[PDB]
Design a protein around this motif. Structure first.
Motif, PDB file in Angstrom:
ATOM      1  N   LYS A 220      70.906  80.909  90.880  1.00 19.74           N
ATOM      2  CA  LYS A 220      69.960  79.753  90.936  1.00 19.74           C
ATOM      3  C   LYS A 220      68.784  80.349  92.008  1.00 19.74           C
ATOM      4  O   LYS A 220      69.003  81.374  92.483  1.00 19.74           O
ATOM      5  CB  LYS A 220      70.615  78.403  91.228  1.00 19.74           C
ATOM      6  CG  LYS A 220      71.321  77.953  90.053  1.00 19.74           C
ATOM      7  CD  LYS A 220      71.696  76.271  90.674  1.00 19.74           C
ATOM      8  CE  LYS A 220      72.642  75.678  89.421  1.00 19.74           C
ATOM      9  NZ  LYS A 220      71.835  74.944  88.434  1.00 19.74           N
ATOM     10  N   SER A 592      62.918  72.172  76.806  1.00 19.84           N
ATOM     11  CA  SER A 592      63.073  73.296  77.864  1.00 19.84           C
ATOM     12  C   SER A 592      61.834  72.903  78.752  1.00 19.84           C
ATOM     13  O   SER A 592      61.786  71.650  79.233  1.00 19.84           O
ATOM     14  CB  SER A 592      63.217  74.507  77.448  1.00 19.84           C
ATOM     15  OG  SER A 592      62.020  75.134  77.119  1.00 19.84           O
ATOM     16  N   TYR A 593      61.093  73.895  79.009  1.00 23.22           N
ATOM     17  CA  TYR A 593      59.819  73.945  79.801  1.00 23.22           C
ATOM     18  C   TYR A 593      58.831  72.715  79.286  1.00 23.22           C
ATOM     19  O   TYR A 593      58.014  71.809  80.063  1.00 23.22           O
ATOM     20  CB  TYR A 593      58.949  74.908  79.769  1.00 23.22           C
ATOM     21  CG  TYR A 593      57.884  75.199  81.063  1.00 23.22           C
ATOM     22  CD1 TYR A 593      56.848  74.676  80.849  1.00 23.22           C
ATOM     23  CD2 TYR A 593      58.469  75.690  82.274  1.00 23.22           C
ATOM     24  CE1 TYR A 593      55.945  74.857  82.131  1.00 23.22           C
ATOM     25  CE2 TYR A 593      57.562  75.740  83.311  1.00 23.22           C
ATOM     26  CZ  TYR A 593      56.380  75.448  83.178  1.00 23.22           C
ATOM     27  OH  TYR A 593      55.480  75.652  84.343  1.00 23.22           O
ATOM     28  N   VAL A 618      63.717  70.494  82.438  1.00 21.96           N
ATOM     29  CA  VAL A 618      63.826  70.906  83.573  1.00 21.96           C
ATOM     30  C   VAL A 618      63.526  69.862  84.648  1.00 21.96           C
ATOM     31  O   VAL A 618      62.274  69.217  84.354  1.00 21.96           O
ATOM     32  CB  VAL A 618      62.979  72.282  84.075  1.00 21.96           C
ATOM     33  CG1 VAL A 618      63.436  72.867  85.448  1.00 21.96           C
ATOM     34  CG2 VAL A 618      63.355  73.322  82.945  1.00 21.96           C
ATOM     35  N   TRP A 621      63.077  72.660  90.350  1.00 19.78           N
ATOM     36  CA  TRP A 621      63.104  73.898  90.008  1.00 19.78           C
ATOM     37  C   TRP A 621      64.294  74.855  90.993  1.00 19.78           C
ATOM     38  O   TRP A 621      64.560  76.212  90.695  1.00 19.78           O
ATOM     39  CB  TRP A 621      61.860  74.557  90.659  1.00 19.78           C
ATOM     40  CG  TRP A 621      60.792  74.377  89.361  1.00 19.78           C
ATOM     41  CD1 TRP A 621      59.780  73.623  89.588  1.00 19.78           C
ATOM     42  CD2 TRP A 621      60.852  74.741  88.064  1.00 19.78           C
ATOM     43  NE1 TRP A 621      59.119  73.593  88.318  1.00 19.78           N
ATOM     44  CE2 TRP A 621      59.677  74.385  87.349  1.00 19.78           C
ATOM     45  CE3 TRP A 621      61.375  75.770  87.427  1.00 19.78           C
ATOM     46  CZ2 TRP A 621      59.507  74.566  85.900  1.00 19.78           C
ATOM     47  CZ3 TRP A 621      61.362  75.894  86.194  1.00 19.78           C
ATOM     48  CH2 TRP A 621      60.318  75.416  85.310  1.00 19.78           C
ATOM     49  N   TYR A 624      67.152  75.830  88.590  1.00 17.24           N
ATOM     50  CA  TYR A 624      66.991  76.804  87.231  1.00 17.24           C
ATOM     51  C   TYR A 624      67.225  78.048  88.110  1.00 17.24           C
ATOM     52  O   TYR A 624      67.333  78.289  89.232  1.00 17.24           O
ATOM     53  CB  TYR A 624      65.584  76.773  86.738  1.00 17.24           C
ATOM     54  CG  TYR A 624      65.321  77.093  85.394  1.00 17.24           C
ATOM     55  CD1 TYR A 624      66.502  76.729  84.286  1.00 17.24           C
ATOM     56  CD2 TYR A 624      64.374  78.070  85.213  1.00 17.24           C
ATOM     57  CE1 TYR A 624      66.291  77.400  83.192  1.00 17.24           C
ATOM     58  CE2 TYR A 624      64.485  78.572  83.800  1.00 17.24           C
ATOM     59  CZ  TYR A 624      65.122  78.126  82.797  1.00 17.24           C
ATOM     60  OH  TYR A 624      65.031  78.619  81.513  1.00 17.24           O
ATOM     61  N   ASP A 625      67.427  79.102  87.077  1.00 13.43           N
ATOM     62  CA  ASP A 625      67.872  80.377  87.533  1.00 13.43           C
ATOM     63  C   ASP A 625      66.736  81.152  88.259  1.00 13.43           C
ATOM     64  O   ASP A 625      65.646  80.786  88.554  1.00 13.43           O
ATOM     65  CB  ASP A 625      68.192  81.378  86.507  1.00 13.43           C
ATOM     66  CG  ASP A 625      67.056  81.501  85.441  1.00 13.43           C
ATOM     67  OD1 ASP A 625      66.290  80.645  85.206  1.00 13.43           O
ATOM     68  OD2 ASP A 625      66.916  82.692  85.133  1.00 13.43           O
ATOM     69  N   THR A 629      62.517  81.388  88.065  1.00 11.93           N
ATOM     70  CA  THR A 629      61.788  80.451  89.015  1.00 11.93           C
ATOM     71  C   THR A 629      61.017  81.301  90.188  1.00 11.93           C
ATOM     72  O   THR A 629      59.859  80.979  90.472  1.00 11.93           O
ATOM     73  CB  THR A 629      62.787  79.541  89.845  1.00 11.93           C
ATOM     74  OG1 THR A 629      63.747  79.049  88.823  1.00 11.93           O
ATOM     75  CG2 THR A 629      62.178  78.317  90.492  1.00 11.93           C
ATOM     76  N   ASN A 672      71.502  77.448  79.653  1.00 16.54           N
ATOM     77  CA  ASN A 672      70.271  77.789  80.237  1.00 16.54           C
ATOM     78  C   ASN A 672      69.766  76.688  81.113  1.00 16.54           C
ATOM     79  O   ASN A 672      69.475  76.937  82.124  1.00 16.54           O
ATOM     80  CB  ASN A 672      69.293  78.125  78.960  1.00 16.54           C
ATOM     81  CG  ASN A 672      68.184  78.888  79.306  1.00 16.54           C
ATOM     82  OD1 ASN A 672      67.924  79.288  80.243  1.00 16.54           O
ATOM     83  ND2 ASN A 672      67.033  78.904  78.563  1.00 16.54           N
ATOM     84  N   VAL A 673      69.610  75.618  80.458  1.00 18.03           N
ATOM     85  CA  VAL A 673      69.137  74.596  81.452  1.00 18.03           C
ATOM     86  C   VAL A 673      70.183  73.385  81.422  1.00 18.03           C
ATOM     87  O   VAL A 673      70.830  72.913  80.494  1.00 18.03           O
ATOM     88  CB  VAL A 673      67.978  73.654  81.006  1.00 18.03           C
ATOM     89  CG1 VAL A 673      67.208  72.787  82.126  1.00 18.03           C
ATOM     90  CG2 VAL A 673      66.807  74.860  80.475  1.00 18.03           C
ATOM     91  N   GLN A 677      70.336  68.731  85.474  1.00 19.43           N
ATOM     92  CA  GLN A 677      69.142  68.508  85.628  1.00 19.43           C
ATOM     93  C   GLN A 677      68.828  67.110  85.058  1.00 19.43           C
ATOM     94  O   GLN A 677      68.079  66.198  85.489  1.00 19.43           O
ATOM     95  CB  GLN A 677      68.139  69.532  84.965  1.00 19.43           C
ATOM     96  CG  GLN A 677      68.656  70.846  85.121  1.00 19.43           C
ATOM     97  CD  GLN A 677      67.674  71.813  85.507  1.00 19.43           C
ATOM     98  OE1 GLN A 677      66.565  71.339  85.897  1.00 19.43           O
ATOM     99  NE2 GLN A 677      67.939  73.252  85.195  1.00 19.43           N
TER     100      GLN A 677
END
Ligand SMILES: *[C@@H]1O[C@H](CO)[C@@H](O[C@@H]2O[C@H](CO)[C@@H](O[C@@H]3O[C@H](CO)[C@@H](O)[C@H](O)[C@@H]3O)[C@H](O)[C@H]2NC(C)=O)[C@H](O)[C@H]1NC(C)=O
Ligand SMILES: *[C@@H]1O[C@H](CO)[C@@H](O[C@@H]2O[C@H](CO)[C@@H](O)[C@H](O)[C@H]2NC(C)=O)[C@H](O)[C@H]1NC(C)=O
Ligand SMILES: *[C@@H]1O[C@H](CO)[C@@H](O[C@@H]2O[C@H](CO)[C@@H](O)[C@H](O)[C@H]2NC(C)=O)[C@H](O)[C@H]1NC(C)=O
Ligand SMILES: *[C@@H]1O[C@H](CO)[C@@H](O[C@@H]2O[C@H](CO)[C@@H](O)[C@H](O)[C@H]2NC(C)=O)[C@H](O)[C@H]1NC(C)=O
Ligand SMILES: *[C@@H]1O[C@H](CO)[C@@H](O[C@@H]2O[C@H](CO)[C@@H](O)[C@H](O)[C@H]2NC(C)=O)[C@H](O)[C@H]1NC(C)=O
Ligand SMILES: *[C@@H]1O[C@H](CO)[C@@H](O[C@@H]2O[C@H](CO)[C@@H](O)[C@H](O)[C@H]2NC(C)=O)[C@H](O)[C@H]1NC(C)=O
Ligand SMILES: *[C@@H]1O[C@H](CO)[C@@H](O[C@@H]2O[C@H](CO)[C@@H](O)[C@H](O)[C@H]2NC(C)=O)[C@H](O)[C@H]1NC(C)=O
Ligand SMILES: *[C@@H]1O[C@H](CO)[C@@H](O[C@@H]2O[C@H](CO)[C@@H](O)[C@H](O)[C@H]2NC(C)=O)[C@H](O)[C@H]1NC(C)=O
Ligand SMILES: *[C@@H]1O[C@H](CO)[C@@H](O)[C@H](O)[C@H]1NC(C)=O
Ligand SMILES: *[C@@H]1O[C@H](CO)[C@@H](O)[C@H](O)[C@H]1NC(C)=O
Ligand SMILES: *[C@@H]1O[C@H](CO)[C@@H](O)[C@H](O)[C@H]1NC(C)=O
Ligand SMILES: *[C@@H]1O[C@H](CO)[C@@H](O)[C@H](O)[C@H]1NC(C)=O
Ligand SMILES: *[C@@H]1O[C@H](CO)[C@@H](O)[C@H](O)[C@H]1NC(C)=O
Ligand SMILES: *[C@@H]1O[C@H](CO)[C@@H](O)[C@H](O)[C@H]1NC(C)=O
Ligand SMILES: *[C@@H]1O[C@H](CO)[C@@H](O)[C@H](O)[C@H]1NC(C)=O
Ligand SMILES: *[C@@H]1O[C@H](CO)[C@@H](O)[C@H](O)[C@H]1NC(C)=O
Lengths: 728, 200, 728
Positions: A220, A592-593, A618, A621, A624-625, A629, A672-673, A677
């Motif tokens: 992360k 996602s975004y 998301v 932040w 997230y990975d 980020t 992924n997400v 979140q």
């Protein structure tokens, strides 16, 4: 009033876009699989030959989904027992079927659960990865040779990538790179020991009474990152009596001071390779070119051969720094390098010279180099009519840089404007696959005289059955907000009138270097919403969108979730002030975004929007990975960017959600997400006390790709949109 | 030949239910050396002088690990749980018992602990609700011997085994208790003899 | 007109029920916490004197949570830093404050994160559990003595119950049982080594970026149950130079055949303890009565003293086998067992004679034994007017069993019908806690001549506030059905007329031995639904409901979800044909088992019901814990009951959900009914393709007792109900 594009038409895929997918095995020919048969096509004269029949397929006891062809054509690799793990990673079983003897090879077959098998570019050398170890077979009827002995499950990856590199850095599961004539095998080894693990439960079928826990090394933001090593092994000196050895090409001295990545590997010439390293603070990349030393047997890299790419205003490259395209002699290469003004253009480089001379210039960006033989370079750019959303194929003479010719601008201006090309081995023939405003048309061309030999597919049957339906239109235009051109797309309902006001749903992605206003023909949920529900589906390209210069793209550097949100809000205000958009029926949705942008738009308290959908958004932040980020925000240390890490969260603005309707959809098995979140979003929204809708999808990935869950999620979003807009 | 009490001091001693009968000293019998090395704590039986001198016919011995902190269950007349389950004194022949303590010398090897079966009852019935304890003969082994004859690890160990027919046709439950280890090992010597070759 | 019971009034608890919780400390003195002051009261006279001051505990930096009093009155035990772990278990810090010296004792404090602290019944001995180890303090200013050295986290539990025993068997976190004069301490050791664990993610506060995963030893249906051992340690022979020796009491050999439980422990006299054991197939239980000898110090349990309870038709007991009530000498006791007709009544038992003589008979069930003296025995039964919902206090004479006197039958016939009692130390006084159709009323009585002393509480101001507001009215009746009366309740709206048809929401639990038609006054969500939205909320007691004989209760033995579902559907049919119920607006909702019943009714395809809510439902019986599922269904062994285990799933009825509206609510951090269950329901519903609503509540247990989450879930349920019924 004929029939419309219904929801069941999209869900059941009644109107299928016909795809003409081919693979070149030589300069002359290519293979096209049709009716479960493999056929050789001679590009000059048509000449539909045959390669494989149905007998080989039905004589085996299991179904085969994919095939691979040896470059010499003497062997075919068959893949069965497909078990997908991630977006690009998979595991399967393989067997080699000889074509000269027309018999299946039964000696030393490829073991079950093989992660990745690749063919050599010439000959029939085979290298595969099993249990994170590399095995090389000189012949398919010969025993394999072990290359790596340090493979370990979820700890050390040899020849394959771990999660973060596959998702962001390499965009592939393959870390194997053969030599151009199949002598050296260059592989990357990834260490995952200090990388913290993510744990989400996996509820399998009803027989399993105890849910399994999925353990994935997930770095992360601000956490430890995997360490990448590089190795080159020699396949020519492979002997079974001793262990094979590899030589570790180390990073440049400017990269070993801090954390570094390995973004791009490209074999430059027959005996030299060109590695491309990237710093953790992703604004400093150095390409290292190393030559094989016959006298010492090792690989040496010169300091003067190193080339440094820098970005003061933001990050380097679009997503990853671009791959170089070396010449035949290997003494020069072509790379996509941003200008002094900001636009990305082709720069002619030399190995021993630091400076490069740009060969293209303008207010447009080169998408990427495709082919170069000795005298012309073929590239894709958005220069035509000043449209960043359109792609065309251009060629430029190497001797005279002024000579630039467009091979796809004038082929069909009213139908095709988004070209993607595939070349042959020596680039004498290229297939143009335009997917512009019209239906996707596939042509075949000869690069000697740039003449259209024949069309491969023009979607005649789909054009026949699309006359009975009210297909939505598509308008591409621009607005000038801050003395700059910002493009937007609109999917409009049929029989569109400017007098009548329509609902507007803002399909938003708004990611860094993301284009959502391109001229690509799509048959998706927006088509159903425009054709059936009469809903204008609009997209916008604000600050941070790519292919428009570094000034627009790098305006979002170190500040995520601020300028794109106000850009989407101002775009919605302009759309409502145009006149044909109902001001009280504006919605917003994203994936996602897109879900993150939708969440910050609804939490901004602007009041323009009525309802919103956030599919796997998301939230924070830090969750997230690390690579994604840290590329656009930097490390969350207290002294660098922690303030905007804690200011750009959805949960900080949960008080303003009371005026909007929120739909929150997330899969429980998302890697992924993660579900964390959306769980935090739900926790904040119930702590504030805001009513909202929700749905979890168990055993579902990021894309929700399983057919039943895909149909259910699109039906539920259709129901939510219909209820929000007070539609029947 | 010449024989004496040599096999009693070899290896680890067994417990009271895992008792070892031995018959030896047929030709000659040796006097007051096992008592010399292992001192006596009590001598009362239904005399030392009568069993000391005087020829016999067949001499048998009984030895097992038996602590001195618990002595009162095994009497000529008693109602202890050890008397009813583990071992009962035999009155068919002139016999005498001896309780001995190991001295500070480590000639004998100590076991884990002292253990004995508390329950050796048989379960039978439609729902296995009738309970019948299994009393044992003075010269016979308890039927719960096969439940770990080396010893019981903890206090509450129960081991069950379905009995064969020709034995009752019911489920057998054997529960064995344990006492903590003392400072030195401790021996229970029981000698039986019947009236001619075994003479001092 | 006048105001109604709104949702804001229910969630904000504006109309608060006033309670009178008192703890008896002596024959005629009891405590009371008035205005944050501990007050000693007198039973005979009524005058109150102050025991603890305000400022004597708030001078510290930590606010106290609850107080524990020593029986001698010399010390007060204060607790703070309360951290809840499960429904019953918690960890907190403790400190001892003297009352003669009037100072705090800081010599040897009780360590932090203490699991369970209890006082001796006489004297001031302490027994607290820390790190699953038993520590005993003879005096609060003395060093502690360690009892158990084998405690381990999630492996060995010494003196405290594990998850399954606390949830089902013991219904408490306490496994410590002092002797009546505080000499022997009895504790149970639980072994959790071979039992599999359950993994669910715990997404904590927003600062934490990596979610935690919780490990709970959870034996599901067919899994391996925990192994129990029982020990008794003499606390009078404790020394600081040697380890304390605990004498183990073995189980009866009837239970050593297979797996077994320890279900009840009761001390008979100072040297006798009675243990109740329950088999894994919970239909054969034996009570073991053990005496303490002085010759050996070993607890001996004779075979002749064992008492065997069995059920040929179902399971023994209501939930667990009933505890005995010994006399003063300890040679006899009174126990509640089922008679030949199937009704629970009291037997006089002798510890040496096997047979019991029934002292009560009829068509009613004795609910429990409250207090026993040498002259009279006090019990609670549902005999009065034959209503199983009502509870009344009766006293029988030990010399003459035919003289039964009722002490709460005619105290207030129109107000109080559900009585609860709390006797003194010598049972010389009893405080009656009615909670009947009227407001709760708390009276104090003396058992010498059954004279009413005074009224402790009658909720006068609450009566004024409730007569200000419109409130719903209850109605209790029954239907004949298959020649057996089944009782039901209906919370009718205010100004209720039969002519107008009202919507129905069938509030259902329908659990085995569950009462849902009792005469209990509650201020719940159903009162808001009846008072504001004018919704008739109904509950039913079909087959399997308790306190109505074993014939009704045991009809659901080895078959769950096939009989009570049919009874709920039949009750809905009868309610619809009563005349005042709209047939098109009938819904159903339930909690836990009620959610399972709701899911099965909706999946039955009857078509009676429109929409349904199922918060934390049961899905498949192989997912719930071993004790509860195996009590009513047996093992999921494929020669015994696997057919009904695999036939009683909600997921087998997923196709019939297309005609109804489903709202599925569950907590992600649930431990009683895991999130796997609703995950499987959602997976089946999206595999079939059924439109339904869902909602997840992160970091919520089975109760969902956090105020924000409680308000949000009840607001969402109200929104779903109002949108389903189309209420104005
Ligand atoms: C709680 O229960 C567990 C098992 O459910 C107990 O662990 C068990 O302990 C015994 C020793 O008392 C182990 O037996 C030994 O096994 C080894 C290997 O087979 C063998 O060589 C020895 O001779 C002896 O038989 C047993 O394997 C072990 N079971 C396990 C670990 O699954 C544990 O002792 C119980 N807790 C307490 C406090 O007694
Ligand atoms: C494939 O390429 C390798 C790399 O150049 C070739 O190997 C070299 O071949 C030359 C020509 O004979 C030799 O002088 C070098 O000593 C070789 N180097 C090594 C490391 O082997 C190889 O010959 C090529 N393959 C074929 C079939 O020509
Ligand atoms: C993968 O990385 C780990 C640490 O991130 C390496 O473990 C270290 O190995 C060196 C030996 O050179 C030791 O001195 C260190 O103490 C080890 N550290 C830890 C934390 O274990 C490991 O060797 C690496 N593996 C490979 C194949 O490179
Ligand atoms: C090649 O290298 C591997 C690993 O370095 C060798 O495998 C090890 O061999 C030793 C004995 O020499 C064993 O003790 C290890 O357990 C082996 N490790 C593994 C993972 O198998 C292998 O022997 C080497 N082979 C040759 C031909 O040198
Ligand atoms: C890459 O980005 C980092 C951080 O965005 C830059 O580091 C900062 O540089 C400025 C100017 O020298 C300093 O004022 C800051 O204190 C630096 N911050 C940190 C955390 O080091 C870095 O200069 C950039 N690199 C290039 C080549 O532009
Ligand atoms: C308690 O239930 C068990 C099974 O759950 C009953 O045991 C079965 O009884 C029938 C009656 O003839 C036998 O045929 C089966 O073989 C029995 N099965 C087992 C596993 O024992 C038992 O009868 C019930 N009642 C009790 C124990 O009182
Ligand atoms: C009481 O019992 C405990 C547990 O058996 C003893 O603690 C162990 O003692 C042994 C022997 O000295 C050590 O090897 C262990 O490390 C100890 N374990 C722990 C957890 O302390 C303790 O010594 C006993 N106390 C007395 C007075 O005998
Ligand atoms: C608490 O009760 C126990 C159990 O009877 C008492 O212990 C016995 O007391 C008698 C005399 O009352 C003695 O003869 C026994 O030797 C005691 N036995 C044991 C094991 O202690 C104890 O005295 C009682 N304590 C008080 C304060 O009354
Ligand atoms: C092979 O099979 C496919 C369908 O399985 C069929 O359409 C095709 O015509 C077949 N081709 C030959 C050459 O048999
Ligand atoms: C078609 O291809 C075959 C081999 O692929 C070749 O032999 C033949 O001449 C070709 N036909 C032409 C060139 O007309
Ligand atoms: C793969 O598995 C199949 C069946 O499980 C087996 O027949 C085959 O031999 C396996 N492959 C290898 C290389 O062992
Ligand atoms: C973050 O928000 C705080 C508000 O408390 C503000 O003071 C600070 O300047 C912000 N930091 C930014 C915008 O970088
Ligand atoms: C004690 O505190 C309560 C509330 O905190 C207050 O009402 C009362 O006046 C205080 N004093 C006494 C003597 O009760
Ligand atoms: C009530 O008054 C009596 C005297 O009439 C007294 O003995 C008793 O202690 C008082 N009760 C309290 C609680 O002070
Ligand atoms: C418990 O924690 C508090 C908080 O620091 C500390 O003062 C106290 O000493 C702790 N208790 C013990 C027994 O150490
Ligand atoms: C119960 O299940 C068995 C097998 O799963 C089936 O044969 C039987 O019909 C089922 N009984 C029902 C559904 O009532």
């Amino acid at each position: 009033s004929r029939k419309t594009y219904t929801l069941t038409d999209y869900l059941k895929n009644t109107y299928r876009l016909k795809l003409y997918s081919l693979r070149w095995i030589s300069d002359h020919e290519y293979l096209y699989k049709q009716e479960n048969n493999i056929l050789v096509f001679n590009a000059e004269y048509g000449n539909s030959s045959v390669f494989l029949e149905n007998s080989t397929f039905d004589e085996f006891g299991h179904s085969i989904n994919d095939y691979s062809i040896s470059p010499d054509g003497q062997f075919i690799l068959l893949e069965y027992n497909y078990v997908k793990q991630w977006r690009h990673s998979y595991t399967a079983s393989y067997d080699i079927y000889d074509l000269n003897k027309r018999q299946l090879i039964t000696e030393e077959r490829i073991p079950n659960n093989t992660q990745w098998v690749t063919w050599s570019p010439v000959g029939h050398k085979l290298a595969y990865v099993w249990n994170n170890d590399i095995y090389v077979k000189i012949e398919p009827n010969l025993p394999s040779y072990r290359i790596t002995w340090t493979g370990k499950e979820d700890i050390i990856y040899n020849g394959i990538t771990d999660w973060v590199y596959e998702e962001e850095v390499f965009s592939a599961y393959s870390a194997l790179w053969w030599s151009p004539n199949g002598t050296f095998l260059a592989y990357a080894q990834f260490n995952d020991t200090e990388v913290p693990l993510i744990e989400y439960s996996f509820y399998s079928d009803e027989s399993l009474q105890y849910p399994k826990t999925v353990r994935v090394p997930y770095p992360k933001a601000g956490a430890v990152n995997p360490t990448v090593k590089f190795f080159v092994v020699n396949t020519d000196s492979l002997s079974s009596v001793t262990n094979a050895t590899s030589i570790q090409i180390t990073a440049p001295a400017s990269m070993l001071i801090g954390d570094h990545y390995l973004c791009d590997v490209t074999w430059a010439t027959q005996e030299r390779i060109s590695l491309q390293w990237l710093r953790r603070i992703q604004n400093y990349s150095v390409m290292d070119i190393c030559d094989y030393d016959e006298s010492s047997g090792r690989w040496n890299c010169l300091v003067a051969r190193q080339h440094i790419e820098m970005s003061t205003t933001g990050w380097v490259g679009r997503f990853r720094p671009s791959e170089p395209h070396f010449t035949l002699d290997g003494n020069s290469f072509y790379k996509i390098i941003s200008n002094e003004e900001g636009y990305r253009h082709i720069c002619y480089f030399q190995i021993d010279k630091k400076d490069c001379t740009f060969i293209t210039k303008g207010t447009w960006e080169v998408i990427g180099i495709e082919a170069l033989t000795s005298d012309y370079l073929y590239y894709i750019s958005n220069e035509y009519k000043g449209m960043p959303g359109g792609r065309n194929l251009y060629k430029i003479q190497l001797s005279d840089y002024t000579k630039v010719t467009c091979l796809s601008c004038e082929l069909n201006p009213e139908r095709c404007q988004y070209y993607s090309v595939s070349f042959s081995k020596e680039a004498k023939y290229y297939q143009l696959r335009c997917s512009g405003p019209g239906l996707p048309l596939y042509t075949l061309h000869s690069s000697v005289n740039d003449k259209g030999l024949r069309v491969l597919e023009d979607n005649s049957a789909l054009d026949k059955m699309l006359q009975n339906v009210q297909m939505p239109s598509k308008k591409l235009d621009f607005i000038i907000l801050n003395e700059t051109k910002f493009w937007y797309q609109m999917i409009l309902p049929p029989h569109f009138d400017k007098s009548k006001k329509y609902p507007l749903l803002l399909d938003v992605y708004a990611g860094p270097c993301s284009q959502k206003a391109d001229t690509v023909f799509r048959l998706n949920w927006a088509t159903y919403l425009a054709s059936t529900e009469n809903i204008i589906v609009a997209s916008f390209d604000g600050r941070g969108s790519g292919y428009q210069g570094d000034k627009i793209m790098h305006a979002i550097n170190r500040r995520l979730g601020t300028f794109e949100v106000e850009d989407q809000i101002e775009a919605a205000r302009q759309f409502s002030k145009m006149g044909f958009v109902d001001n009280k029926r504006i919605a917003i949705w994203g994936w996602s975004y897109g879900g993150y942008v939708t969440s910050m738009v609804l939490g901004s308290g602007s009041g323009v929007f009525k309802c919103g959908i956030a599919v796997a958004p998301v939230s924070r932040w830090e969750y997230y990975d690390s690579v994604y980020t840290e590329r656009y925000m930097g490390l969350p240390t207290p002294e660098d960017n922690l303030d905007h890490y804690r200011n750009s969260t959805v949960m900080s603005r949960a008080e303003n959600f009371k005026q909007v309707e929120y739909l929150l959809i997330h899969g429980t098995a998302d890697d992924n997400v993660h579900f964390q979140q959306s769980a935090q979003i739900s926790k904040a929204l119930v702590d504030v006390g805001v009513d909202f809708q929700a749905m979890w999808y168990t055993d579902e990935d990021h894309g929700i790709a399983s057919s039943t869950a895909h149909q259910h999620i699109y039906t539920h979003m259709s129901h939510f949109i219909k209820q929000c807009f007070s539609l029947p | 030949v010449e024989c004496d009490f040599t096999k009693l001091l070899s290896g680890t001693p067994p417990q009271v239910y895992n008792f070892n009968r031995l018959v030896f000293t047929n030709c000659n019998y040796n006097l007051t050396k096992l008592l010399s090395l292992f001192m006596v704590n009590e001598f009362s039986c239904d005399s030392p002088d009568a069993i000391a001198r005087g020829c016999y016919s067949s001499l048998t011995v009984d030895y097992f690990a038996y602590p001195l902190s618990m002595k009162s269950y095994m009497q000529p007349g008693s109602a202890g749980v050890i008397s009813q389950y583990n071992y009962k004194q035999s009155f068919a022949n002139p016999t005498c018992r001896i309780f001995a303590t190991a001295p500070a010398n480590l000639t004998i090897t100590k076991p884990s602990s002292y253990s004995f079966i508390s329950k050796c009852s048989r379960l039978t019935g439609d729902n296995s609700h009738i309970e019948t304890p299994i009393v044992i003969n003075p010269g016979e082994y308890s039927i719960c011997k096969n439940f770990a004859p080396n010893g019981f690890s903890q206090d509450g160990d129960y081991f069950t085994r379905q009995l064969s027919q020709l034995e009752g046709g019911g489920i057998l439950v054997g529960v064995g208790s344990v006492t903590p280890m003392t400072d030195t090992l401790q021996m229970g010597f029981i000698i039986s003899v019947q009236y001619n070759s075994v003479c001092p």
